[PDB]
C-alpha cells in the first residue's frame, strides 16, 4: 500500500523488459561490427531506436514515484539513474538541433583530412595517415606540418559548432538543477544515502587538484628527462630550459608518450623484453592466447569462460569478404552473453591487450547477478581499470618465465628494472597531466568563468604551466585546438582516464600485499594466489549497487582516493631520474615560446 511496493513492483517489471530489449540492440550492434553491409545498418538503427524510446518512455513513470518517501536504499539507487530524463527535458525544437550537431561534428572528425598546398588533388586522413606521420617521422617540418594542418583545417569548422554545443548543454543542467553541465559529469561520483560515506560533487574538484600536486615531483623529472633526450637530437629546435614543442611529443595531442620510447630508452645495449619471437617459433594462434589468458584467471580463483563464449565470439579477421572494425572492445550483451571482438595477430602488444579485454568479461560476470539498472561499473573509472591491473601482472618477467615465453635463464639486474618502468612511465604517468588539464578546461568553460574569447588564451596557459608544452605556432581566436580531439567532439567525458590510473595501483598494492609478495612492486605477480583473487572478487560482484567509496574500502582498506601507490610503484624510477637530472634544469617557465626571438 506504500510507494515502496509500487517502486519494487515497477522496477521488477522494468528489469525483465530491459533485459529483452537491450539484448536486441546489443546483438544488432554485434551484427553491424562483425558484418558491415547496408542491410545490417537498418537492423541496428531500428533496434537502437526502440531501446532509446524505451528508457525515454519509462522515465515518464519513474518521476511519478518520489524518492522522498522511499526508505530502502537499493530501490533509491536504481530510480536515481532511471529518473533522470537527460536531454528529453529540453524543448523539442532544440532537441533536433542537439542531435544534429552531435552527428555533424562526429562526421567532421571522421571525414576530416589534411591537404598539402603543393598537390591539392592528393590528401591524407588522420587515421592511418597522420597517426603514421606523427609516430614514425623524426623530421621537424614533417611533424609540424601534420600538427598544424589538422588543427587549422578541422578547427575552423568545429569551433562555431562547438560554441552552440556549449549553449545547449548548459540549459539542460539547470533544468536538472545542476550548477552547470560540468557538474553533470561530476555527479557520477556523487554519494548520498549512506552516513559518513557521502562524497559530494564538489569534493571531486578539491581531491583531484590535491592528488595531482604529489604527482608533480615525479612528472617534473620525467619531463626533464624526455626534454634532455630530445634536446640532443634537436639542438636548434628545442631549448634546454623551455617547454617541449607540441608536435615532438610522439603523437598529435601529446596524450601518449609511448612513441618517444625509441629515443628516450634508458639503455640501448640491453635487450628489451619481447615475447614476439618466442610466440612465432611455438606457432600460437588466437585460440591458445586466450587459453593462456583464461588460465591466468583460474589461478586467482575467478570463474572461467562459458561454453557459448568460444562459439559466439569472432577472434580473427573474418577474411576479405566482409570488413569489420578491429578496434578491441569487450561486448557485454546481457543475459549471460559475453563476447570479445578482436582482430588477433601475434605480437607482444596483443598478448598484453588480451588480458585487458578479458578483464572486462571477468568484471561483468561478477555483478551479472545484479539487476540491469545495477549492472554497470561501481563508478565510471573502475570498469576500465580492472582490465589494466591484470595486464600489469602479465607484463612482469616472472609471469612470462612461468608460461614459457621468456627463457628461464634470462638475466635480471638494475638496468632491466629501469627499462621496463620508463616504458610504463611514459604511458601511465605521461597521460595524467594531459588528462587533468582537459577536465579542468571543460569545467571552467561550462561554469562560465572563461569568456568565449579567452578560450584559446586560457588553453595554452594550461598547456605551458601544467603539462610543460608550448605551441609551435601561435593560434588566433579562429582555431579551436581541443575540438579536433576524439573525445572532445564525440561527447565522451574524459575524466575516466585519470581515475583508472589512480585506482589501478591502489588495487595493485592492495592485492600484492595480500599475496605476501616480497620486494619491489613492479615485479609482483598475482598468479596462484587465491588470497588476492577472493579479496578482489568481493568488490567486483557488488556492481553499482553500493557506493564506490564503500566498495573501495574493502579492497584497499581506504575510503579516499590517494596517489601513494603511484609514487611507490615508480619509486625505483623516481630515484634514478633525479640522478640523471642533477646536471639538468628541473622545471619550466611559461614565458618562453619558439616563435618569440
Amino acid at each position: 500500500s506504500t510507494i515502496e511496493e509500487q517502486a519494487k513492483t515497477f522496477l521488477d517489471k522494468f528489469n525483465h523488459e530491459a533485459e529483452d530489449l537491450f539484448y536486441q540492440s546489443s546483438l544488432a550492434s554485434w551484427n553491424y561490427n562483425t558484418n558491415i553491409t547496408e542491410e545490417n545498418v537498418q537492423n541496428m538503427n531500428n533496434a537502437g531506436d526502440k531501446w532509446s524510446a524505451f528508457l525515454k518512455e519509462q522515465s515518464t513513470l519513474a518521476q511519478m514515484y518520489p524518492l522522498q518517501e522511499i526508505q530502502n536504499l537499493t530501490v533509491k539507487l536504481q530510480l536515481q539513474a532511471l529518473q533522470q530524463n537527460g536531454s528529453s527535458v529540453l524543448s523539442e525544437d532544440k532537441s533536433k538541433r542537439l542531435n544534429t550537431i552531435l552527428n555533424t561534428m562526429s562526421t567532421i572528425y571522421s571525414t576530416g583530412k589534411v591537404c598539402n598546398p603543393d598537390n591539392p588533388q592528393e590528401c591524407l586522413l588522420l587515421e592511418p595517415g597522420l597517426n603514421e606521420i606523427m609516430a614514425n617521422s623524426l623530421d621537424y617540418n614533417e611533424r609540424l606540418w601534420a600538427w598544424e594542418s589538422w588543427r587549422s583545417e578541422v578547427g575552423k569548422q568545429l569551433r562555431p559548432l562547438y560554441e552552440e554545443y556549449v549553449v545547449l548543454k548548459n540549459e539542460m543542467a539547470r533544468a536538472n538543477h545542476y550548477e552547470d553541465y560540468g557538474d553533470y559529469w561530476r555527479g557520477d561520483y556523487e554519494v548520498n544515502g549512506v552516513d559518513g560515506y557521502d562524497y559530494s560533487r564538489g569534493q571531486l574538484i578539491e581531491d583531484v587538484e590535491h592528488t595531482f600536486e604529489e604527482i608533480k615531483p615525479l612528472y617534473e623529472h620525467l619531463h626533464a628527462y624526455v626534454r634532455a633526450k630530445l634536446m640532443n637530437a634537436y639542438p636548434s629546435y628545442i631549448s634546454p630550459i623551455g617547454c617541449l614543442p607540441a608536435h615532438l611529443l610522439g603523437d598529435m595531442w601529446g596524450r601518449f608518450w609511448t612513441n618517444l620510447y625509441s629515443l628516450t630508452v634508458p639503455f640501448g645495449q640491453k635487450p628489451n623484453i619481447d615475447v614476439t619471437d618466442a610466440m612465432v617459433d611455438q606457432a600460437w594462434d588466437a585460440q591458445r592466447i586466450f587459453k593462456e589468458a583464461e588460465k591466468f584467471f583460474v589461478s586467482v580463483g575467478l570463474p572461467n569462460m562459458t561454453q557459448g563464449f568460444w562459439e559466439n565470439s569472432m577472434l580473427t579477421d573474418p577474411g576479405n569478404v566482409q570488413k569489420a572494425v578491429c578496434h578491441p572492445t569487450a561486448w557485454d550483451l546481457g543475459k549471460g552473453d559475453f563476447r570479445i571482438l578482436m582482430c588477433t595477430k601475434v605480437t607482444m602488444d596483443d598478448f598484453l591487450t588480451a588480458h585487458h579485454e578479458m578483464g572486462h568479461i571477468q568484471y561483468d560476470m561478477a555483478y551479472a547477478a545484479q539487476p540491469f539498472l545495477l549492472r554497470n561499473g561501481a563508478n565510471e573509472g573502475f570498469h576500465e581499470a580492472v582490465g589494466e591491473i591484470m595486464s600489469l601482472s602479465a607484463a612482469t618477467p616472472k609471469h612470462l618465465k612461468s608460461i614459457g615465453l621468456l627463457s628461464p635463464d634470462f638475466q635480471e639486474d638494475n638496468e632491466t628494472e629501469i627499462n621496463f618502468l620508463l616504458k610504463q612511465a611514459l604511458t601511465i604517468v605521461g597521460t595524467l597531466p594531459f588528462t587533468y588539464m582537459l577536465e579542468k578546461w571543460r569545467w571552467m568553460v561550462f561554469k562560465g568563468e572563461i569568456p568565449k574569447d579567452q578560450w584559446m588564451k586560457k588553453w595554452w596557459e594550461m598547456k605551458r604551466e601544467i603539462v610543460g608544452v608550448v605551441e609551435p605556432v601561435p593560434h588566433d581566436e579562429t582555431y579551436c585546438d581541443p575540438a579536433s580531439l576524439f573525445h572532445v567532439s564525440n561527447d565522451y567525458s574524459f575524466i575516466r582516464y585519470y581515475t583508472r590510473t589512480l585506482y589501478q595501483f591502489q588495487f595493485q598494492e592492495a592485492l600484492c600485499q595480500a599475496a605476501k609478495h616480497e620486494g619491489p612492486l613492479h615485479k609482483c605477480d598475482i598468479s596462484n594466489s587465491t588470497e588476492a583473487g577472493q579479496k578482489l572478487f568481493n568488490m567486483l560482484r557488488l556492481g553499482k549497487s553500493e557506493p564506490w567509496t564503500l566498495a573501495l574500502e574493502n579492497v584497499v582498506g581506504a575510503k579516499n582516493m590517494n596517489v601513494r601507490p603511484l609514487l611507490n610503484y615508480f619509486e625505483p624510477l623516481f630515484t634514478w631520474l633525479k640522478d640523471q637530472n642533477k646536471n639538468s634544469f628541473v622545471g619550466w617557465s611559461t614565458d618562453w615560446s619558439p616563435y618569440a626571438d
Partner: protein, 194 residues
C-alpha cells in the same frame, strides 16, 4: 501388460509454459526408471524422500508427470522449501514433496534465432500459490489502489511475461525442459511397479 508412456511426456515436441504447466496422469502400467537413470542425457536428476535405486523395486499407485519450461538458473527453485518467482508465482511444490526432479538442455530445439515468445511466465500475483495449484487467470495485476478496469497503465501490469530464447545465450540462461514427477499413496491399489 503395458509400458507407461513416458515417450510422449519427455519427447513431446512442444511443452506448456510454466504457468500453463500440463498435468498428465500416469496409472495402470509399468514404469522403467533404469533407462531414465542410465541415459545420462539429463543435466539435473534428483529425488526427494525416495532413492533412485530403491524406487526401481517399489509400488506407487499414482504418478503425476508435470511438464514446463523454465530458465537454467531457475531450476534450483524447484524443490521443497524454496522461494522466488518460479516457486511462489508459478509452480510450487510442498515441503513434504516425495517425488523427483528431472531436467535436460532444450537449447538445441526450443530456442531459435530472434527469440521464441510462446513460452511465458507469471511475474506478479497477489499472493503465493498453494501446493500444486494451476492459475491460468490473465486478469491484470493491481499494484496500487488505482482501479485498473483491465487496461494497462500506471501501477496496472500485464502479469504474463515472455522468455526470449535465441541460441546464443550462455549456459546459465539456456532453456531447460523440466519434468516434475509426483508420487502419492491412497486407498486405490498400486498398479505401477518395477
Amino acid at each position: 501388460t503395458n509400458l507407461c508412456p513416458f515417450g510422449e511426456v519427455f519427447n513431446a515436441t512442444r511443452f506448456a509454459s510454466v504457468y500453463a504447466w500440463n498435468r498428465k496422469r500416469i496409472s495402470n502400467c509399468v514404469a522403467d526408471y533404469s533407462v531414465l537413470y542410465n541415459s545420462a542425457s539429463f543435466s539435473t536428476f534428483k529425488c526427494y524422500g525416495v532413492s533412485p535405486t530403491k524406487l526401481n523395486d517399489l509400488c506407487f499407485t499414482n504418478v503425476y508427470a508435470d511438464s514446463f519450461v523454465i530458465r537454467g538458473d531457475e531450476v534450483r527453485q524447484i524443490a521443497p522449501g524454496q522461494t522466488g518467482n518460479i516457486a511462489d508465482y508459478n509452480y510450487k511444490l510442498p515441503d513434504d514433496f516425495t517425488g523427483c526432479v528431472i531436467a535436460w538442455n532444450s537449447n538445441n530445439l526450443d530456442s531459435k534465432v530472434g527469440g521464441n515468445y510462446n513460452y511465458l511466465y507469471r511475474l506478479f500475483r497477489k499472493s503465493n500459490l498453494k501446493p500444486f495449484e494451476r492459475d491460468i487467470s490473465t486478469e491484470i495485476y493491481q499494484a496500487g489502489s488505482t482501479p485498473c478496469n483491465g487496461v494497462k497503465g500506471f501501477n496496472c501490469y500485464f502479469p504474463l511475461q515472455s522468455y526470449g530464447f535465441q541460441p546464443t545465450y550462455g549456459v546459465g540462461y539456456q532453456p531447460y525442459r523440466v519434468v516434475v514427477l509426483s508420487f502419492e499413496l491412497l486407498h486405490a491399489p498400486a498398479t505401477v511397479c518395477g
